[PDB]
Amino acid sequence: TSAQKAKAEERKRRKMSRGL
C-alpha cells in the first residue's frame, strides 16, 4: 500500500524532532 511504502523509503529524514 502507499503507507506501507513509506516505511521502505522514509529511512532518511525520519521526521525531524518537529511535529509540524
Question: What is the dihedral sign for C-alpha 6, 11, 13, 17?
Answer: positive
Written as nine digits, the cell of 7 is 516505511
Length of the chain measured in residues? 20
Dihedral angle of Cα 13, 14, 19, 20, to the nearest 10 degrees: 30
Method of determination is: NMR
The Cα 20–Cα 17 span in angstroms is 9
CA 1 to chain centre: 14
Q: Which residue has the cell 500500500?
A: 1
- The amino acid that residue 1 corresponds to is T
- The amino acid that residue 15 corresponds to is K
Written as nine digits, the cell of 1 is 500500500
- The amino acid that residue 5 corresponds to is K
